[PDB]
A paper describes a structure:
In contrast, bacteria utilise the FASII system which involves a series of discrete and functionally specific enzymes that produce fatty acids primarily destined for incorporation into membrane lipids. FabG (3-oxoacyl-ACP or β-ketoacyl-ACP reductase) converts β-ketoacyl-ACP to β-hydroxyacyl-ACP in the presence of NADH or NADPH. FabG enzymes belong to the vast superfamily of SDRs that play a broad number of biological roles in eukaryotes, prokaryotes, and archaea, typically sharing 15–30% sequence identity and ‘fingerprint’ motifs. We provide high quality crystal structures for three enzymes: a functional low molecular weight FabG, a putative FabG protein, AbSDR, and a HMwFabG.
Residue numbers in the entry:
A (entry chain B): 23 to 404, 414 to 463
B (entry chain A): 4 to 463
Amino acid sequence: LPSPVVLERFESAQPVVKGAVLVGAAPSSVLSGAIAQVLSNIHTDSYVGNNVALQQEAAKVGLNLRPFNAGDKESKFKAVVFDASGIQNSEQLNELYKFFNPIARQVATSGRVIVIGTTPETAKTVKQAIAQRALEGFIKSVGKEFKKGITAQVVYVDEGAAANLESTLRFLLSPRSAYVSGQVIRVSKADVVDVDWAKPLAGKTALVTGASRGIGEAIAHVLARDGAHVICLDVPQQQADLDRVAADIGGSTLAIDITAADAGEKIKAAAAKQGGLDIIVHNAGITRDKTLANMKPELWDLVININLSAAERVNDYLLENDGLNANGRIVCVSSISGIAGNLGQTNYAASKAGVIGLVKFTAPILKNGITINAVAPGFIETIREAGRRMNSMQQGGLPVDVAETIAWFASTASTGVNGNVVRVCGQSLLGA
Amino acid sequence: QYQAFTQSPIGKFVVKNLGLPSPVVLERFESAQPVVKGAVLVGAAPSSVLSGAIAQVLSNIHTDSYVGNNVALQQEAAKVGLNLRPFNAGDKESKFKAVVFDASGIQNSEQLNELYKFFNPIARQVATSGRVIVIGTTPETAKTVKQAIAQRALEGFIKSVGKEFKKGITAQVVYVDEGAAANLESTLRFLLSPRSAYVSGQVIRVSKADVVDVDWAKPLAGKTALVTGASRGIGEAIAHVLARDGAHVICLDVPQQQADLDRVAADIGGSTLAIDITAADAGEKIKAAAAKQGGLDIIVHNAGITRDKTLANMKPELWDLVININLSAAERVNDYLLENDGLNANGRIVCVSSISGIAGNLGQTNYAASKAGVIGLVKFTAPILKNGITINAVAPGFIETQMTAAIPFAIREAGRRMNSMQQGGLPVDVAETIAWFASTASTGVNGNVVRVCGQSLLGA
């Protein structure tokens, strides 16, 4: 067996993409102007084949699209981006072949395959809905086949929501998404909001539960790296570690039990002096693994309470009592076990499938531009021989990989990212 | 080779998730009666709303049914004519072939412990080849957000039970749309029965529709079915089960397969149609072939091919052929039948996807695209169907066929081991699931994609 490729991860705000991007599009596509504008914004060398319509879209936004000689098998591209919105029926799925077959060996190590389509439920015809649905099978197979640490994603843009794609395209193009692969992201219509892309949380106040250690600590570091003032929450027994984490990020502490009845009240009170809470990350979670036959009742109850019920109560309080600011963010943490189940985890998997429902059925009732999304981490370094290699990256992920994905959800610019559950698993074999 | 696989990281991955291989010989269908061999234990959360419909099914199938100290459940079952015998909660010895729980009364996450209350005491008393069945309210139809969330959580529970209980036991969640309880029966019978032997870990949605009369012993009696790819393999097995259930089966396959088609049709009292399903006139010829038998009721799109190649090495025609046979040809035929009076009322379209359409696979960019498209064909055709017609798909996992010996060792070994049954499935397992969709009674089963995979570890 080979040992795993070393993945490229975030080093600095610029460049967003180190290396060249190759763009393609199907005939009659509608997202190419929005894609070209992002590539212009991030000042990357961008290339295109013999597609006049796509060349015209980049001209309209001032993107110098360097033509890519189709006889060139030697050049390497850090990302390949395909607008599939123009695929109108199953026979036009060969537009995927026409773009990706000629360059399938020219994606760089730690590269990116990104297919951008139209959300199948928003497609105007059944034939297009079917074709757009098929894109997920294609990208998941690419994710397993291309190797070299390359990730593969489909971004579905709701019909008419091209203006809302930028923060998602930026995340996927960048090394920040190093451990996100095989996934489906849905972009919906929302107001566009000004942002400093170098500090996309500047001026915001975030709260991270379970912040004193582990992934919660990593979350707090990335939110502070993006410009946020982070309130680090954990139980008073963890005050020393809370103080350590807060001192490392210029943050503050809130030492309470998130399951207490008054937790939402105290969270709102804590953020009042900063001008209110913008971002809450429900990272607090526990496992109490036991076969159901051996499991004690309180170990069922505790896992449901901390992992699910507690976040419900806090969300209910904040949303009903002006506890989150406009354009605010709720980010939850599910798990692959919540999607796929796991032996000894009837309690944990129930709780984390609950978290998926919390995201999916809260998202439609949010107002004031608030969004709710979740990450579903796979094998992250902190069954262990099992998890580690059983993914397209052939390695476990790092806490920063989960934190980067949470920070993309929390970005001031991700107004149109809502109701998503995105696995952070390097395309783990496991699933539903 | 086998010891090396076990010692390898994927072999250790299997053992950490499923334990060491202890597969069971799975019970499969033998006769229409009894539906369930053995006793059934029924339970319900407080304030549940599906227990009268569940009890009516258990009364219809004449199974020995038991209940704990749930007075409301006992009273509702008695009202609809079901005798529920008390199950002494101190009895760790009795075995149940099926345990059925009405979870519709779970109104929020704190009430998820009703799952623990019912299932923890009997977690070692489910029989070999038994059934765990949780029946809830479809989350998208729940009246409150809190209940939607709690009903969504049921899937994580049942998927974990499916991996934990072992012994060939399957675990399912059936979601019943609010108001659709009378449409549950064919699904509950399928899951209670050995017919569903290789279906586990799955989510089935029951929606509101007319309740139609049926002979449960011959649930396709009087109907005409067409099976594509019928001359061998899974298509042959589908044809056998549809005939077993009472249908006249038209077996369709390419003219080069005429000998095998003739052999299969004579084995089931059916007929043949020797055409290429991709032909522009395949829809016309299908309708013509059923015309002299009262028209076509059921079509099973089982024809399918692989042309496995990395995308870099794949030729254009090997992309095109896979999309055409596996996806575009079924679209054309459905479009023709649905627009030109080619399917009878209460008709059935059943498609075949694949785990690779859900999970992706190296060397299958073409095949996985085509089979993900099949999921879209089901999901986006279902809402526009009229006249009681339904469309569903099976998504088979690793099935033992005559083609399995051609699969390279490591892919085949992972296929056999990486599922909760710790074994590959049989073609009849796929056929039974298709037959349940095709049932004259399955009127409120529409738009479902159900994996037939023994709860394979793979997925999305």
